[PDB]
Design an enzyme around this catalytic site. Structure first.
Site, PDB file in Angstrom:
ATOM      1  N   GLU A  82       1.015  -0.952  -0.143  1.00 22.00           N
ATOM      2  CA  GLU A  82       0.289  -0.092  -0.119  1.00 22.00           C
ATOM      3  C   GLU A  82       0.256   1.120  -0.173  1.00 22.00           C
ATOM      4  O   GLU A  82       1.932   1.593   0.426  1.00 22.00           O
ATOM      5  CB  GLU A  82      -1.144   0.454   0.958  1.00 22.00           C
ATOM      6  CG  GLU A  82      -2.440  -0.599   1.025  1.00 22.00           C
ATOM      7  CD  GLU A  82      -3.153   0.613   0.298  1.00 22.00           C
ATOM      8  OE1 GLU A  82      -4.574   0.247   0.282  1.00 22.00           O
ATOM      9  OE2 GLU A  82      -2.697   1.225   0.010  1.00 22.00           O
ATOM     10  N   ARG A  89      -7.303   2.880  13.690  1.00 23.79           N
ATOM     11  CA  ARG A  89      -6.603   3.156  12.828  1.00 23.79           C
ATOM     12  C   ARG A  89      -6.223   3.782  11.981  1.00 23.79           C
ATOM     13  O   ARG A  89      -7.339   4.678  11.023  1.00 23.79           O
ATOM     14  CB  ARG A  89      -5.075   1.581  12.412  1.00 23.79           C
ATOM     15  CG  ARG A  89      -5.809   1.457  10.942  1.00 23.79           C
ATOM     16  CD  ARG A  89      -4.964  -0.179  10.605  1.00 23.79           C
ATOM     17  NE  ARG A  89      -5.411  -1.273   9.865  1.00 23.79           N
ATOM     18  CZ  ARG A  89      -5.672  -0.407   8.353  1.00 23.79           C
ATOM     19  NH1 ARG A  89      -4.875   0.048   7.981  1.00 23.79           N
ATOM     20  NH2 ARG A  89      -6.845  -1.083   7.056  1.00 23.79           N
ATOM     21  N   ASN A 137      -5.174   5.382   8.090  1.00 24.91           N
ATOM     22  CA  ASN A 137      -5.408   4.286   6.717  1.00 24.91           C
ATOM     23  C   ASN A 137      -5.228   4.945   5.862  1.00 24.91           C
ATOM     24  O   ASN A 137      -3.567   5.692   6.029  1.00 24.91           O
ATOM     25  CB  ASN A 137      -6.494   3.898   6.214  1.00 24.91           C
ATOM     26  CG  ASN A 137      -6.357   2.402   5.278  1.00 24.91           C
ATOM     27  OD1 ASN A 137      -5.426   1.886   5.051  1.00 24.91           O
ATOM     28  ND2 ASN A 137      -7.406   2.440   3.781  1.00 24.91           N
ATOM     29  N   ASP A 147     -10.993  -3.528  12.673  1.00 22.99           N
ATOM     30  CA  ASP A 147     -11.917  -4.529  12.196  1.00 22.99           C
ATOM     31  C   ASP A 147     -12.692  -3.939  11.174  1.00 22.99           C
ATOM     32  O   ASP A 147     -13.755  -4.490  10.476  1.00 22.99           O
ATOM     33  CB  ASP A 147     -12.531  -5.646  13.517  1.00 22.99           C
ATOM     34  CG  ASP A 147     -13.205  -4.988  14.067  1.00 22.99           C
ATOM     35  OD1 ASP A 147     -12.900  -3.222  14.266  1.00 22.99           O
ATOM     36  OD2 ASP A 147     -14.725  -5.153  14.606  1.00 22.99           O
ATOM     37  N   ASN A 162      -9.781   5.947   2.346  1.00 18.90           N
ATOM     38  CA  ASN A 162      -8.977   6.015   1.075  1.00 18.90           C
ATOM     39  C   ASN A 162      -8.508   6.659   0.403  1.00 18.90           C
ATOM     40  O   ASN A 162      -7.901   7.456   1.189  1.00 18.90           O
ATOM     41  CB  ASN A 162      -9.925   4.266   0.856  1.00 18.90           C
ATOM     42  CG  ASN A 162      -8.458   3.080   1.028  1.00 18.90           C
ATOM     43  OD1 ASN A 162      -7.427   3.317   1.101  1.00 18.90           O
ATOM     44  ND2 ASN A 162      -9.387   1.306   1.034  1.00 18.90           N
ATOM     45  N   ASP A 204     -10.586   2.271  -3.753  1.00 24.40           N
ATOM     46  CA  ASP A 204      -9.161   1.921  -2.756  1.00 24.40           C
ATOM     47  C   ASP A 204      -7.939   2.710  -2.947  1.00 24.40           C
ATOM     48  O   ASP A 204      -8.264   4.011  -2.890  1.00 24.40           O
ATOM     49  CB  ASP A 204      -8.593   0.819  -2.993  1.00 24.40           C
ATOM     50  CG  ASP A 204      -7.502   0.353  -2.019  1.00 24.40           C
ATOM     51  OD1 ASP A 204      -6.972   1.158  -1.216  1.00 24.40           O
ATOM     52  OD2 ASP A 204      -7.498  -0.474  -1.568  1.00 24.40           O
TER      53      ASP A 204
HETATM   54 MG   LIG Z   1      -5.566   2.050   0.582  1.00 28.16          MG
END
Ligand SMILES: [Mg+2]
Ligand SMILES: [Hg+2]
Ligand SMILES: [Hg+2]
Ligand SMILES: [Hg+2]
Length: 306
Positions: A16, A106, A108, A126, A158, A210
């Site tokens: 990523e 968290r 991202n 989760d 994202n 994403d």
């Molecule tokens: Mg991503």
């Protein structure tokens, strides 16, 4: 377009956060789940990595400060000092914890806007597809090293991009299966007027958006997780699919332009097998790919300014 697997790099659990530093011709990226940062220098065929003990989701060079990087460590934004080759950092200095009391979240995806401000969002550790907890928000890191919040109720925080005239910001909550557009005010760093730009369901595009990036013509390149592809979409008019490029790995995660002429597209993917996959395990590997012959150039990665 030509798609090549970058043999030198191996397989990642969740590759990523690709970032191309044009001055050193170096690609940096992360494996979120394996808690590692990665460096690849294509012209010299050099690969190195660096281990930490928190979940990580981006790595961006710090402006003006060679050898220092701004990274995420679970919910902390931190400066890592790293020689680019040893397997552990020299030192870690936390800047801010963005959500000190939300223990199961968290950070991202994160990226600097064209002015050098870090934007990044959170999500449940989760979080799930297509349904899971919805606990994330979108922040930027301001001058007094404290965060400002811009959006909330985000499922899977994202990809981010900004228009070439600094008038628009594009944003992906993977859980919504669409790319949103906002008016962006560069003076106040405020976003408003949220509207859908591109809705997967209307175009029979499988999977989930994403990571994303923008090219010199203003079109978006969007990684499609569980779609085995990247798509090219218009920003001039809503709901326009311009092109599709298939990528062998089904779980494509993100994209960055790189190479000496900024016309090679580096693509990360995830080998982690998920339940309810539409793909058998033998197909899900997590390679890194390079795509050439797209006919467009992008921009170099922007460093974070603190
Ligand atoms: Mg991503
Ligand atoms: Hg590293
Ligand atoms: Hg590192
Ligand atoms: Hg390191």
């Amino acid at each position: 377009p030509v798609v090549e697997k970058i043999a030198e790099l191996g397989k990642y659990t969740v590759g990523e956060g690709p970032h191309w530093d044009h001055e050193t011709q170096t690609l940096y990226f992360v494996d979120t789940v394996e808690k590692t940062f990665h460096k690849y220098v294509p012209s010299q065929k050099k690969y190195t990595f660096c281990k930490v003990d928190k979940l990580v989701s981006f790595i961006i060079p710090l402006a003006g400060s060679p050898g220092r990087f701004v990274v995420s460590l679970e919910r902390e934004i931190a400066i890592l000092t790293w020689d680019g080759v040893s397997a552990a950092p020299t030192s870690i200095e936390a800047i801010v914890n963005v959500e000190p009391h939300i223990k199961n979240n968290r950070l991202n995806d994160g990226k600097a806007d064209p002015l050098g401000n870090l934007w990044t969002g959170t999500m449940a550790i989760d979080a799930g597809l297509p349904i899971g907890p919805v606990t994330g928000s979108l922040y930027h890191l301001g001058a007094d090293k404290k965060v400002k919040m811009h959006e909330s109720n985000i499922a899977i925080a994202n990809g981010l991009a900004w228009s070439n005239d600094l008038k628009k910001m594009y944003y992906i909550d993977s859980g919504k299966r669409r790319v949103d557009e906002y008016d962006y005010d560069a003076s106040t760093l405020s976003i408003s007027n949220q509207r859908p730009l591109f809705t997967f369901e209307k175009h029979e595009v499988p999977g989930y958006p994403d990571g994303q990036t923008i090219d010199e013509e203003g079109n978006l390149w969007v990684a499609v997780f569980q779609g085995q592809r990247i798509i090219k979409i218009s920003t001039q008019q809503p709901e326009v699919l311009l092109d599709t490029v298939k990528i062998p790995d089904p779980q494509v995660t993100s994209v960055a332009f790189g190479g000496p002429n900024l016309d090679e597209l580096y693509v990360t993917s995830a080998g982690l097998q998920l339940d309810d996959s539409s793909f058998d395990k033998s197909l899900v590997n997590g390679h890194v790919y390079r795509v050439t012959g797209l006919g467009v150039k992008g921009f170099a990665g922007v460093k974070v300014k603190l």
